[PDB]
Design a protein around this motif. Sequence first.
Motif, PDB file in Angstrom:
ATOM      1  N   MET A   1      64.505  40.324  59.711  1.00 36.61           N
ATOM      2  CA  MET A   1      64.566  40.043  58.248  1.00 36.61           C
ATOM      3  C   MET A   1      63.171  39.774  57.695  1.00 36.61           C
ATOM      4  N   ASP A   2      62.856  40.401  56.567  1.00 38.39           N
ATOM      5  CA  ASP A   2      61.571  40.230  55.903  1.00 38.39           C
ATOM      6  C   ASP A   2      61.741  39.319  54.696  1.00 38.39           C
ATOM      7  N   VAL A   3      60.929  38.270  54.633  1.00 39.03           N
ATOM      8  CA  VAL A   3      61.015  37.299  53.550  1.00 39.03           C
ATOM      9  C   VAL A   3      60.355  37.876  52.307  1.00 39.03           C
ATOM     10  N   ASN A   4      60.987  37.666  51.154  1.00 46.14           N
ATOM     11  CA  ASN A   4      60.473  38.167  49.889  1.00 46.14           C
ATOM     12  C   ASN A   4      60.818  37.191  48.768  1.00 46.14           C
ATOM     13  N   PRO A   5      59.872  36.358  48.326  1.00 48.09           N
ATOM     14  CA  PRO A   5      60.201  35.379  47.278  1.00 48.09           C
ATOM     15  C   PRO A   5      60.669  36.009  45.977  1.00 48.09           C
ATOM     16  N   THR A   6      60.159  37.189  45.616  1.00 51.86           N
ATOM     17  CA  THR A   6      60.512  37.778  44.329  1.00 51.86           C
ATOM     18  C   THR A   6      62.013  38.008  44.209  1.00 51.86           C
ATOM     19  N   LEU A   7      62.687  38.313  45.319  1.00 49.37           N
ATOM     20  CA  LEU A   7      64.129  38.523  45.269  1.00 49.37           C
ATOM     21  C   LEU A   7      64.864  37.283  44.787  1.00 49.37           C
ATOM     22  N   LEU A   8      64.214  36.118  44.833  1.00 51.08           N
ATOM     23  CA  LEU A   8      64.816  34.908  44.292  1.00 51.08           C
ATOM     24  C   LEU A   8      65.190  35.069  42.827  1.00 51.08           C
ATOM     25  N   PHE A   9      64.517  35.964  42.103  1.00 53.76           N
ATOM     26  CA  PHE A   9      64.839  36.179  40.698  1.00 53.76           C
ATOM     27  C   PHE A   9      66.177  36.877  40.499  1.00 53.76           C
ATOM     28  N   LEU A  10      66.780  37.420  41.560  1.00 52.53           N
ATOM     29  CA  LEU A  10      68.090  38.043  41.432  1.00 52.53           C
ATOM     30  C   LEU A  10      69.204  37.027  41.226  1.00 52.53           C
ATOM     31  N   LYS A  11      68.963  35.760  41.546  1.00 47.92           N
ATOM     32  CA  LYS A  11      69.931  34.693  41.333  1.00 47.92           C
ATOM     33  C   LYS A  11      69.463  33.667  40.315  1.00 47.92           C
ATOM     34  N   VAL A  12      68.184  33.318  40.324  1.00 48.98           N
ATOM     35  CA  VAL A  12      67.602  32.393  39.357  1.00 48.98           C
ATOM     36  C   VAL A  12      66.969  33.220  38.244  1.00 48.98           C
ATOM     37  N   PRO A  13      67.343  33.012  36.973  1.00 49.97           N
ATOM     38  CA  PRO A  13      66.702  33.774  35.891  1.00 49.97           C
ATOM     39  C   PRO A  13      65.186  33.683  35.942  1.00 49.97           C
ATOM     40  N   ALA A  14      64.505  34.652  35.329  1.00 49.52           N
ATOM     41  CA  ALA A  14      63.053  34.726  35.450  1.00 49.52           C
ATOM     42  C   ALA A  14      62.382  33.480  34.886  1.00 49.52           C
ATOM     43  N   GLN A  15      62.838  33.008  33.726  1.00 50.79           N
ATOM     44  CA  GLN A  15      62.197  31.862  33.091  1.00 50.79           C
ATOM     45  C   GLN A  15      62.486  30.557  33.821  1.00 50.79           C
ATOM     46  N   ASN A  16      63.655  30.437  34.455  1.00 49.46           N
ATOM     47  CA  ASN A  16      63.972  29.222  35.195  1.00 49.46           C
ATOM     48  C   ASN A  16      63.145  29.073  36.462  1.00 49.46           C
ATOM     49  N   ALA A  17      62.462  30.132  36.902  1.00 56.95           N
ATOM     50  CA  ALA A  17      61.586  30.064  38.066  1.00 56.95           C
ATOM     51  C   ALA A  17      60.249  30.732  37.782  1.00 56.95           C
ATOM     52  N   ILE A  18      59.819  30.724  36.517  1.00 58.26           N
ATOM     53  CA  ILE A  18      58.576  31.381  36.138  1.00 58.26           C
ATOM     54  C   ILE A  18      57.370  30.716  36.782  1.00 58.26           C
ATOM     55  N   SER A  19      57.491  29.446  37.175  1.00 60.06           N
ATOM     56  CA  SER A  19      56.366  28.760  37.800  1.00 60.06           C
ATOM     57  C   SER A  19      55.903  29.482  39.057  1.00 60.06           C
ATOM     58  N   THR A  20      56.816  30.170  39.745  1.00 59.90           N
ATOM     59  CA  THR A  20      56.451  30.903  40.950  1.00 59.90           C
ATOM     60  C   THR A  20      55.500  32.057  40.662  1.00 59.90           C
ATOM     61  N   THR A  21      55.451  32.540  39.422  1.00 58.82           N
ATOM     62  CA  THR A  21      54.631  33.685  39.055  1.00 58.82           C
ATOM     63  C   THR A  21      53.256  33.285  38.532  1.00 58.82           C
ATOM     64  N   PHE A  22      52.809  32.060  38.813  1.00 59.87           N
ATOM     65  CA  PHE A  22      51.520  31.551  38.345  1.00 59.87           C
ATOM     66  C   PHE A  22      50.689  31.144  39.555  1.00 59.87           C
ATOM     67  N   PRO A  23      49.826  32.028  40.067  1.00 64.18           N
ATOM     68  CA  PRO A  23      49.007  31.686  41.244  1.00 64.18           C
ATOM     69  C   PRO A  23      47.832  30.778  40.892  1.00 64.18           C
ATOM     70  N   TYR A  24      48.148  29.571  40.424  1.00 64.80           N
ATOM     71  CA  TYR A  24      47.141  28.604  40.002  1.00 64.80           C
ATOM     72  C   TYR A  24      46.810  27.600  41.103  1.00 64.80           C
ATOM     73  N   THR A  25      46.975  27.993  42.363  1.00 67.76           N
ATOM     74  CA  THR A  25      46.595  27.166  43.500  1.00 67.76           C
ATOM     75  C   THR A  25      45.339  27.668  44.199  1.00 67.76           C
ATOM     76  N   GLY A  26      44.736  28.757  43.713  1.00 68.47           N
ATOM     77  CA  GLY A  26      43.540  29.309  44.304  1.00 68.47           C
ATOM     78  C   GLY A  26      42.377  29.269  43.325  1.00 68.47           C
ATOM     79  N   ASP A  27      41.212  29.664  43.819  1.00 61.03           N
ATOM     80  CA  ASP A  27      40.015  29.635  42.995  1.00 61.03           C
ATOM     81  C   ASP A  27      40.142  30.655  41.866  1.00 61.03           C
ATOM     82  N   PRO A  28      39.923  30.262  40.614  1.00 60.12           N
ATOM     83  CA  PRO A  28      39.988  31.229  39.518  1.00 60.12           C
ATOM     84  C   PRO A  28      38.785  32.150  39.537  1.00 60.12           C
TER      85      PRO A  28
END
Lengths: 735, 100, 716, 249
Positions: free
Chosen positions: A1-28
Amino acid sequence: MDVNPTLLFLKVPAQNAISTTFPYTGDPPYSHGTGTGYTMDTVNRTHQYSEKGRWTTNTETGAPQLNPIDGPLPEDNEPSGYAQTDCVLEAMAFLEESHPGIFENSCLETMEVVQQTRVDKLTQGRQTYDWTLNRNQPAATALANTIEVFRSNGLTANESGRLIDFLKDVMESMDKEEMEITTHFKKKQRLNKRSYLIRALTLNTMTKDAERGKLKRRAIATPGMQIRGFVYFVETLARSICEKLEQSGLPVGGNEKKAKLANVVRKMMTNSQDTELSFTITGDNTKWNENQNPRMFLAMITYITRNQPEWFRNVLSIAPIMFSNKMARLGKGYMFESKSMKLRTQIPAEMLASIDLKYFNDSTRKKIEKIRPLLIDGTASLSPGMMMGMFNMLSTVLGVSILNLGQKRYTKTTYWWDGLQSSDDFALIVNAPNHEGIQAGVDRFYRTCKLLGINMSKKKSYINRTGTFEFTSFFYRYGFVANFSMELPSFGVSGINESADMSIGVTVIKNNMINNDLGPATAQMALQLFIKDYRYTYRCHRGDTQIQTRRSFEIKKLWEQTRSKAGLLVSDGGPNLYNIRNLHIPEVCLKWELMDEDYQGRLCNPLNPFVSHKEIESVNNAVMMPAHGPAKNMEYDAVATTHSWIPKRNRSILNTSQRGILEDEQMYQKCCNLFEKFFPSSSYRRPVGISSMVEAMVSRARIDARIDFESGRIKKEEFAEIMKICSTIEELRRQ
Amino acid sequence: QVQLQESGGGLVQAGGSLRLSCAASYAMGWFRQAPGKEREFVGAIKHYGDSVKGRFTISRDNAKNTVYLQMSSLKPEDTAVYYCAAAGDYWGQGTQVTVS
Amino acid sequence: MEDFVRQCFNPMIVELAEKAMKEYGEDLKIETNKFAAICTHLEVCFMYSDFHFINERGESIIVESGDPNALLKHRFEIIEGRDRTMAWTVVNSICNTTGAEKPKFLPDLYDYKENRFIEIGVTRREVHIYYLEKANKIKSEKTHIHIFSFTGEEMATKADYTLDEESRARIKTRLFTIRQEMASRGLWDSFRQSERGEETIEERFEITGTMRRLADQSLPPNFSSLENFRAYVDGFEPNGYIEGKLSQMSKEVNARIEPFLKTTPRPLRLPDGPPCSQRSKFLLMDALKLSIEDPSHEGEGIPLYDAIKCMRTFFGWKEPNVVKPHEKGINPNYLLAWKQVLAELQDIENEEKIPKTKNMKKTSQLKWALGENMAPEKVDFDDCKDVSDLKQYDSDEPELRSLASWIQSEFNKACELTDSSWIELDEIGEDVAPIEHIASMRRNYFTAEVSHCRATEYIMKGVYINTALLNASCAAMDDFQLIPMISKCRTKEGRRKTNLYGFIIKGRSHLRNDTDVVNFVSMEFSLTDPRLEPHKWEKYCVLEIGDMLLRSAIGQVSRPMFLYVRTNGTSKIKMKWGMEMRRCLLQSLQQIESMIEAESSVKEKDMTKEFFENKSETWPIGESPKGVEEGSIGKVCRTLLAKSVFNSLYASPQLEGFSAESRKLLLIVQALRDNLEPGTFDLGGLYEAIEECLINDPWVLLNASWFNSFLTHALR
Amino acid sequence: MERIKELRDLMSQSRTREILTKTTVDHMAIIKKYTSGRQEKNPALRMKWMMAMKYPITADKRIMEMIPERNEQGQTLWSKTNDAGSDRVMVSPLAVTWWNRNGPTTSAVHYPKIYKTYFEKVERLKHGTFGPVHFRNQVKIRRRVDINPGHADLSAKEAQDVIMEVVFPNEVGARILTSESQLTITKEKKEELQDCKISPLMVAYMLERELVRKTRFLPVAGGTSSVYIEVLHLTQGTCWEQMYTPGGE
RNA sequence: AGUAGAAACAAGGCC
RNA sequence: GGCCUGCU
């Protein structure tokens, strides 16, 4: 099995998990070298979006300027800066009609402010382009240098202490045959009329760093000091105007923005009956600043200031007049490398006019070839449009006029639209009885926008049914949803000082719990991680550990000396008592009752040599540049302790020809400290008057010696000694 | 209306002393004129010029209607054609003082 | 009239009056009688105050000339002759020290005997009216008032006259001197009545000169002067001009809405080229740990001694030899550097006490490996212009590289559990509120879920490595420094343990700008043979250094044990951001707690315990060849934590651009799935914007592949 | 005595004499802010970078005569090299901790009287009583509320004159406060802080914070009281409500 | 070589 | 070889 976080949007609406789409943990992303390429590209792009205008040559600056206003109407969907004067005047007239008395009132308060404003208000600003040295310097330093040069040249009206008088002197300087400036390498150099005009009309270009959300870097601009007063007055008027417009969202905060967005969506959808369909457009404007012509802002302000005193109109019109002739400095320059000979070189941008093009690549070669005709004295004329959001509020006013122009009273059709505009971004709710009506409404809105020099980015915009949209990283889905990924970068040590960092961290956790719906357990984890990072950054560990550091010895002896060790601050190696209930209490006051009186007295001792307070403005205010936003200031609750030190300064000035600035700094600070000791209220309320230092200081010495004898330590011997010493300094100032 | 007559000039030794007096028929001045020059301010009534301060003293008797100029420690550079007395528009004819 | 103040009054008073003239901003050429009147007021103030001294008694001592002594006290101390700010300063100071009452207007003098103010005013009119006039101007005043007038008369309340009468004879002699000197001048045609209290001014901001011409060149194309344009604007009224141009404007200027259906979105195209390589600053999936089982905590201990003790725990060292070359460097340099590190480690082992931080020798080996003296020397353009090779720095789009399958497996095993706890959290104030207890229980659940996760181990590794590297760079800027990679965990049995992945040699780190690069060389033990996925190790040099024996049922494996050696670099910004990797825990667990709270808002009860124990509900967290696979909430926690960790590790501008331009399309797709009739104006433009961010970064390419898979599974 | 003496010493040297003579009072602020130091763009990065240096903080020169140059083992506490554009000297962070273990001690009894707001917060929380947590969807609606719970019904400018007359009684100028509420506030805060020696500027700042009313827009659900808004983070959440009653009530 | 990515670092300047 | 600076 291959892990894929994006598939999480198939159950959680995009806006309810939009924080996952913000890579603000690395150097800008950061820029590394010159910003000259970006400046040239922006100038060429601004000039070619208005190519079909008409060319002229200014008789004063001798620079080529392009006027597209009233030019041919666009025939394609590409960006266009061909704004029509009559259309924009009509839009402003309709804005006035829908909001009677807006312009007259706003002009009245602006007139009050302009005629009571002071010069010192210009010091409350970040980096500004000093023309005395042709470089960016702090606002206060540039203002002081310009005032010194003016006084040396004979323009001393600013001694009245009024910003209006300073602007009068600035304009009078424009009509001088020969000014004089100072340069260190001191040499006195003479600037003729045209050179000084270009130096006063020029902008300094830099590259914007720490910009998250795009692959390519951009360029930003900083104006001089001659034009900042007019800009201040114009922005005061624009802010006073927008405060009376509910469709604007620029002069408010984030929560107010969300509240207004919710109100407008509810108003539009609720009033719509079952027959009317509703659609929300999440629109972004492509090349917002490059397509806004300063002449059009001049037209808008002169329409706003109708039936007003002519001096007010002139002072408010001076700013766009200078922007229409604004020049931009190309930038730092270009650095070349030769691998065959293994060397590097740095050519300044001012050589781009004459330097051969053999060293430049194809792209830069073509950019230089296209921008050369506009090069005048090492700077390029940028008349067609604004550079970087200097007139944010006026642009918001224009956008609000466009939004209001569809109130169903001017549409004259079943369809209508409303929404919210904040420069470069907008949400547009359009209602119409059928899809054809919605299409016609959006088409007419786009067409009207193109008549005002405003373009809608088709690539970054989309339309759906109302109930789901976005606005400035705020995602609305039947109610705004918290993100918490925009504030993640602010969860570390701010970098002010120990007490300030602690208070700022706890306050940020608290605020993000209140606003951004941060969870309790998440907040506790954030507190734990922040405490860990704080201890590891300031070398202040719990004290009961064996972590050897440069500060672990004194901390350990303080630990073993203290009896009630629960009262020690985390800065001194004590336990952390913070929790969700204690996030709104300063550390000193939370541990006050647990501290030993000896340690408590040593900590909060006024005579400590570390605490330094300069002004009422900089007591407990910290400037934290938020991610994805403009620089902001925060009030942080803190107690003045021995940990409130201020950190070391840069210290690299010692190797530069501008080394005398440090001696001037030291002497000015010595004089200011003496004055403050003579005038204790110097910091809290800035003194006003037209006398000189020594007069006030000596006279107050007279009086204070007198009265402090009439009751106090002084004695006749000392009082007479002071009186004759005052006479001595008097005769010294005589000679 | 105001006639003025000076008295008390003459030939004197260097470092000597001399009391000029002017009888009158208001503020008063003493002025002097060297052979090679125009008027020079001496004293008024009190204020004295730099070249004569500390040496010379002006005084008046309003009952006698007289202004006096007490010169002491005289120099060859006090020599003038003439020490004239003045009322303020009204000028004396002047009295010769020659120091040597 | 000004000739009078030229002639009579002394300089001091005339410039004092001139500054008082400048005070309120009116000009002296229009009305000068005020100047003379107030300067005479100021003169009487002086002449009344001076020549009047006091000693320790009352009964002021009056001396025509102050003798040299400490006895120079002044009987009356002046108020006026100062600026308004200082006049009120003296007023307030006197009130606060004398305990007297504060007047509302400006006094002129203060006296001790009677401990109060004097407001001297000598007006042209007779006293017996001006006195009570100024008296009714001043409310309920205890400050004594005294005024003269030209006729020579004096008056005062209480019949009080505060000092000698010869001084007042002086005053009135001065007064009649003034009077019968104007007699010679002749000013009373206006002297009695020359000021009436005029205060008015008009602000003038006139555009003229050069600045006017600029205004004439900042108008619409068919205007000639700012006057004409302003007249036109004032005369302008709306007469349906927007409608005319809208009708005349070409109809090709439109914003037609293209419907967005299930068949509309196409998969994002990925770049093609050589496979993607590894970019991390340390091994993530192929790391090996040498341990000691000590009781020390994370920060507790000394690095070098712990590293040496851990390395002595392993037996089977062999003479190192090249297995996989760097393919672009000098592998013998890496070999010699490894042997040098071993030799100097032994050298430390021999001596008395292990140093807290060690400096290494600057041999040619590490001079090449750390890139020393390779920056071109900076010169002036005027001296290097004829060099043909002289050109700009290489500025072009990065090399294109296609995605490889190794990043997928690395992320897969980055979300797997472990046999250790890699997070030892700090202390918090004892929970007092029930909500605090709920928060603590939730936090304990998440810590139990995520502590045994490779993502937490990577977080600790990165934090420690970057902290040590930054501190060494800031401290030992010049000299190469040795730093052993150390991470301390806790076993299931509870015994604490240390782990040594390898070593880092930091080089010259004179970092001025936030983008300046510090180069180091990293060495890490591993067992993964690099002969199976060579394209993932393009920039590594891998040697064979020993053999390891791990207990297995198949006799005992006696596997090889290799050393991955490479030259890497970082910067101040990268070090700072990598030392704040612990906020990935925040991001992830905030997302999970938001999920829990959102679900618990439905059922009026906290839902954490059943989520974490029953594991009934599951979320799609990956796809298997059979189909989409769902996992419990803990697996979602670990997956999000790994995603955040990889975001922090493989951060780049490509990631930001792709994230933004793909969040846009994700929102559009979500609107489609919600039956909200989404529409687009230019979808091809958005696709081109997304596809330009995918160049060579393994992480962003993997994210794009995930997005394509999500689109394929969605839209059904 | 001293003050006029360094005044005369300054006027002795030509450059400072010229600065004192030609510079007018109004320009006071400008030259006081005249500095070559740029405002930091990334404070966290450099605070994490500077603290790894020796002598990373700055302190007044007087530190050289209260704290020894080195501690027991010889770790240096301060250096005599002055800062870039100031007479202050760069010192190590240990000089802070040293000051907290052997530095001079004073009587900090009056700090609670000065920092009234923070100690009032602590007292209010210490006597608070919590209640059960109720889990149900909270309709957070955004409203304008006052955060400062001790505002005396005064604006910034309105209380600024009060603050000056309380701290700087002589620089008040024309203003003499008319409202009797201001009279009583002046009397109380004058007799209370009559000899406090913390600093005039900090005293004025904290009086401004305490008396001046301040308002901000926040998402609230219930509460709306000043005392209930400071703990808004602890009483209201996304799906949980925590009943709370501060010690004041 | 390496980091990195539309331009830079891989110390700078002063004697 | 000796000394200076690390946002100017």
